[PDB]
């Protein structure tokens with residue numbers, strides 16, 4: 001048969017695949033929104049159904065040579081439709097794997113806690129009570145109690161489900177001709193040197209990260225005292241405003257260089273201006289429309305969940321953005337709260353939605369990111385513009401003020417503790433999981449190799465001694481839910497490449513120009529930038545990701561150049577200020593995990 005004829009076969013296969021994948025997504029949404037055992041059975045049934053379909057599709061497609069085919073687009077449609085992943089397993093083992101994952105995720109989403117000092121109040125959750133305690137409370141013993149409560153409840157109790165998940169994740173990789181689950185994840189980036197590229201970015205980031213780490217540690221020790229914060233050891237992580245210490249934005253003002261100069265937390269103005277969750281999504285919609293990009297369809301507003309329900313049902317509150325593989329059926333589920341942190345999450349998620357809308361005209365197997373990092377980068381690029389004093393003044397969230405060099409340091413500092421510190425964190429999560437998947441990290445050393453890696457690359461440690469009887473990795477959503485995390489590392493690098501290109505197109509960035517830096521660029525209302533961005537996103541997965549990147553940046557590789565430029569003024573200030581203050585840089589290894 002001619003390629004124009006094979007193209008008719010896959011076209012019929014594509015519609016078959018799309019319909020069962022939609023049915024499966026729909027059942028997953030219902031569980032995600034309403035965690036009942038009944039809804040779990042329907043989720044795995046619909047997943048089992050799709051697994052059958054994908055097996056049949058994969059066999060049906062082995063009847064075409066693909067080495068005498070010429071349309072490259074066509075070869076690519078057949079390869080992506082034939083990629084089974086977990087569906088490669090016999091159905092019994094498939095449902096056993098999904099049940100192991102759901103067992104972890106369910107335990108995470110359903111955890112509840114008694115208040116510090118009040119055993120009669122035991123309805124506290126991660127979202128919102130614990131998140132906000134860590135964000136705003138500066139009492140170490142209270143923070144330590146909740147840290148211990150959280151990890152004891154979401155980590156060790158699911159060790160066995162985790163072990164089962166690892167074993168069958170491996171079986172699925174072998175049945176797909178990969179050496180391990182780690183090769184499967186890395187395959188999504190389509191570059192055999194990609195693991196090395198990530199190590200190279202970590203090494204370029206490290207000197208800057210270590211200067212910032214050193215300043216934060218110095219300030220936390222001045223605030224909390226030397227018995228709590230060692231001047232030379234890793235930072236007790238429960239003091240960094242976040243249960244995983246993945247971003248330290250919540251202690252930015254508490255530790256800022258110039259606390260009596262203008263600060264850039266707009267939470268109080270959001271509250272004071274009567275902001276609501278819906279208003280917050282409306283403003284993110286407006287930013288995308290200002291870029292000549294797709295306005296949110298009405299289906300989004302009808303079916304999205306944008307506040308935590310008040311009816312006591314269990315659900316996954318971890319914010320997510322869903323593509324139902326139809327037309328304009330796109331939804332966010334977010335337990336939104338009215339503060340600046342959540343305002344950026346809004347944009348992150350709406351970037352996922354916008355990507356969905358831009359490539360929904362493609363065949364189903366191209367309806368994804370160019371690689372998983374492109375998907376995570378989209379909304380964060382907007383958040384880079386939204387975070388500038390320029391934009392916050394436009395939208396009225398930041399009152400006017402005299403700008404000087406110290407206000408600019410407070411600004412650079414906030415950005416560093418919000419975004420720069422996350423890269424070592426994101427790196428360690430998949431370096432750890434790759435090690436479990438590959439066998440380099442064995443079950444009897446699961447916990448101390450985790451905390452050892454967190455100490456090596458992030459210089460943070462638990463507030464109490466942990467042991468191998470603890471098992472702490474699943475205390476992080478993406479571990480319990482089996483969501484690859486390198487996507488966020490890649491995003492945090494390339495999003496600055498995307499931001500630089502979009503600012504250039506908006507006439508907001510000139511290299512070397514003090515009035516047009518990456519740090520003060522706002523691409524709000526730049527249809528010139530939106531148009532080039534639209535083009536990249538409309539590709540979905542139809543081209544190799546270097547070609548998608550070139551569309552917006554003229555470059556074809558991930559590079560830390562952009563992000564090192566963004567943070568160079570902060571880096572120069574820290575180098576001098578740590579020397580002046582006598583702050584130690586670097587850290588001894590943590591002693592907080594015992595084997």
Ligand SMILES: *[C@@H]1O[C@H](CO)[C@@H](O[C@@H]2O[C@H](CO)[C@@H](O[C@@H]3O[C@H](CO)[C@@H](O)[C@H](O)[C@@H]3O)[C@H](O)[C@H]2NC(C)=O)[C@H](O)[C@H]1NC(C)=O
Pocket residue numbers: 034036037038039313
């Ligand atoms: C969360 O998920 C549960 C399922 O696990 C939903 O439960 C379902 O609730 C509906 C009503 O809201 C029940 O419908 C009733 O069915 C009976 C007989 O089938 C009929 O006599 C009634 O007229 C009514 O239609 C349904 O039975 C029930 N399903 C199960 C399996 O118990 C629940 O509604 C969900 N909650 C939210 C807020 O979506």
Ligand SMILES: *[C@@H]1O[C@H](CO)[C@@H](O[C@@H]2O[C@H](CO)[C@@H](O)[C@H](O)[C@H]2NC(C)=O)[C@H](O)[C@H]1NC(C)=O
Pocket residue numbers: 292527528531
């Ligand atoms: C906003 O985007 C639309 C496409 O979604 C642009 O429409 C194109 O406009 C050019 C004008 O040079 C035409 O040649 C194309 O045929 C149009 N295509 C479509 C699909 O409409 C529109 O130009 C963009 N607006 C701005 C201000 O950039």
Ligand SMILES: N[C@@H](CCC(=O)N[C@@H](CCC(=O)O)C(=O)O)C(=O)O
Pocket residue numbers: 246318319320321345348349352376483488
């Ligand atoms: N860096 C953040 C991002 C996590 C987040 O908020 N949402 C996820 C949901 C993904 C999914 O459920 O498949 C997403 O939007 O990517 C963190 O670690 O908290």
Ligand SMILES: [Zn+2]
Pocket residue numbers: 348352375376
């Ligand atoms: Zn995301």
